[PDB]
Design a protein around this ligand. Structure first.
Ligand code: NA
Ligand code: NA
Lengths: 527, 115, 115, 65
């Protein structure tokens, strides 16, 4: 305060090789304004000192185009590893001097500071930004929350919803659902204007557009099933991948052009869908774009059978049979709409990634490893059932030993050679290795994860049906007659009647006199 | 025994039938072959035979054969080892881990439900 | 402190921040620069890594007789130093020993199965 | 521990002159004369705000220049 009264510059932007990326390297991106590290380093008394000075600018941007509020968003990391002053330093700086002008400002790369809480993944500042109840009446204009009417313990809340749902470009629901790079997506969709809005958009148009896509695809695979089991065959090696019947009784003419259209349409839709987002080799191609990938593998594989008819390969039936087995196994995608099967479809998805994939690398190493050793004894010039025209190679010592995990028939320790108390020894070595040790790891390993995942398997499912609603709403090019919201209902202003709204409810505790209200206690619309 | 026919195996039998029927038609589309199974003039080898030879892979069957069948038997061997990886080592062993979570969740209040 | 296994006195001996300036010489820790919440610490490392005989990393790893080895390698100059020594020469000398031995067993496999 | 058992074995079975430097070498301690005892670098985070008395340099992050 001596240096402020001496005449120091209160607005001096410090550039340099700080704000280095890689926080580990030198690194303290704080905006670079002198007002900011007052607020960033938890100095509440000197935040008050700089705001009293009339020379102090508040609106001034930075090297990244960021204002005071963009900087204060991108330092929070948690509630745990901080005192949580960022929530109250955000509130202190708005009310001290603020119109909407300091909030609406986009940065260098065109990004609202509401959206900066989304894309950076700062969850704790985003719970504050959506509610923001303002008690004091001369500046209740800048709130995102309004108590309509109370009457006691059943009060009707109302959220603002001006940049949340996909009605503009790049809104905060479209960021937080489609995003990679964050481990905090599934927790952030618990928050109130994001939670009830996905329930409403599911209620009036998604529930049909999901169950009709189920019916358009369940009827698809049956038409692929019947044409390749009932009548592929007539007497010769005529290929005929999808049956025609040029004659009367229009069934296979209707069946063939049914499949070839829906196979192309599910390929062009997914071929643009996979050409929107870039995964990075694992963990993002395996969670969000998996059933985008599985459908596209199935779709190209069907249209490849047409080019097998082009000049008559040998693969016209052997390729098309792969499209049928994969065509039923990806029906497990479309049971994402149900609740109780929804939790089950993530505990089958996570344990092919976490427990059996560790298993199949270890089990193959014992399958191949003891496989060659029994194959080196089996030869013997006596091998198996008159070894002149018969068999008894390596793969026979795999097929006689892959069958020891399940029912085989008779395990024989007979006619084979030089030391059969070694051939009997490696067999009982293998059954001790993988029948009683290494298979029974897997039930104990799965038993540890499904009590570790099924405390948060619900919210991961809530994300997975959130990925579909914003896709169906994006692939709906009508004028969007389906209104999800109270439209153009009034905010608290003499002139500002805009910003269509939302309705929710509250319950018993914390009794108080109700100061701020909008109407004289109705519950519905009056009359 | 009453709650887990409602909570865990009823989710199971809808998923397992979808793999039973789903890989069922694919092995049935290869089995025909005009060589199907033991002189296919009076004998059998239809769809249900590719279910009975594949429902028996969960329990003891006898000999699992990958013999005389047709065009690419490194696909017929591939879908068999696809099925055993799908439901012998993944989808049956879900169920013991899923039952193990509920019977420590129900048997803290299973007494009063009996009362 | 290492060979006896006293873990709690060994967390103190490696940091030992000394606040008072006339005897900051005997500390094992120095704050280089701070500027706020991103400060760059600096550990002493004079008898820790295997650069002399019988140093405190060589005791605590090769030792029997203690049940407290795996907990004591959580401590700060012992933890980041194993990450650095893994980073620049061990990651190759482990993956080359993997390649010298995976190619070894194949040459033992093929000569005793094929011919 | 089990990968700690291997690194000190490979480093013991490496009889070169050990060119691989793992550390800031001969960086200064707080003394008028004692410039020795090669060092290490780590980082700290948010809590417990205080005026910083003991420091070595006038706030760079890397080596100056
Ligand atoms: Na268990
Ligand atoms: Na059996």
């Amino acid at each position: 305060a001596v240096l402020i009264a001496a005449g120091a510059d209160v607005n001096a932007h410090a550039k340099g090789v700080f704000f280095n990326p890689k926080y580990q390297h030198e690194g303290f991106y704080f905006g670079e304004t002198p007002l900011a590290l007052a607020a960033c380093t938890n100095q509440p008394e000197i935040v008050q000192l700089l705001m009293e000075n009339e020379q102090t600018d508040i609106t001034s941007q930075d090297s990244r185009g960021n204002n005071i509020l963009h900087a204060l968003v991108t330092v929070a990391e948690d509630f745990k590893t901080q005192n949580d002053f960022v929530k109250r330093m955000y509130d202190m700086i708005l009310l001290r001097s603020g119109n909407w002008e300091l909030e609406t400002m986009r940065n260098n790369d065109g990004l609202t500071p509401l959206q900066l809480a989304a894309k950076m993944g700062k969850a704790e500042i985003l719970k504050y930004i959506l509610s923001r109840e303002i008690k004091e009446k001369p500046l209740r204009s800048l709130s995102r929350k309004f108590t309509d009417w109370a009457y006691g313990p059943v009060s009707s809340s109302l959220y603002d919803l001006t940049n949340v749902d996909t009605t503009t470009d790049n809104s905060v629901l479209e960021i937080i659902v489609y995003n990679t790079n964050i481990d905090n997506r599934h927790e952030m969709l618990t928050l109130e204007p994001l939670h009830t809005l996905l329930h409403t958009k599911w209620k009036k148009f998604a529930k049909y557009m999901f169950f009709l896509s189920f019916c358009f695809y369940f009827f698809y695979n049956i038409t692929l099933t019947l044409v390749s089991y009932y009548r592929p065959r007539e007497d010769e090696d005529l290929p005929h991948p999808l049956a025609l019947t040029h004659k009367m009784s229009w069934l296979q003419l209707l069946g063939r052009m049914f499949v070839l259209i829906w196979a192309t349409c599910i390929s062009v839709k997914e071929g643009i869908a996979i050409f929107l987002l870039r995964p990075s080799d694992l963990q993002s191609i395996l969670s969000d774009a998996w059933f985008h990938f599985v459908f596209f593998v199935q779709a190209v594989l069907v249209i490849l059978s047409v080019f097998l008819y082009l000049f008559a390969y040998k693969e016209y039936l052997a390729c098309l049979v792969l499209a049928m087995a994969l065509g039923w196994a990806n029906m497990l995608a479309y049971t994402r709409g149900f609740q109780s099967m929804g939790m089950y479809s993530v505990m089958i998805q996570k344990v092919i990634l976490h427990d059996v994939l560790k298993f199949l690398f270890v089990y193959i190493l014992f399958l191949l490893g003891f496989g060659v050793a029994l194959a080196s004894l089996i030869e013997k010039c006596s091998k198996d059932k008159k070894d002149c025209s018969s068999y008894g190679s390596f793969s026979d010592a795999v097929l006689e030993l892959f069958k020891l995990t399940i029912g085989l028939g008779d395990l024989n320790i007979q006619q084979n050679s030089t030391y059969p108390i070694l051939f009997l020894f490696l067999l009982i070595t293998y059954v001790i290795l993988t029948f009683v040790l290494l298979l029974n790891m897997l039930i104990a390993l799965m038993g540890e994860t499904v009590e570790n995942v099924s405390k948060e398997s619900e919210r991961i499912w809530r994300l997975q049906r959130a990925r579909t609603i914003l896709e169906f709403e994006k692939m709906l090019p009508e004028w969007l007659r389906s209104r999800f919201r109270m439209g153009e209902l009034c905010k608290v202003a003499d002139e500002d009647f805009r910003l269509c709204l939302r309705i929710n409810e509250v319950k018993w505790t914390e009794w108080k006199t109700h100061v701020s209200f909008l109407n004289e206690d109705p519950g519905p619309i009056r009359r």
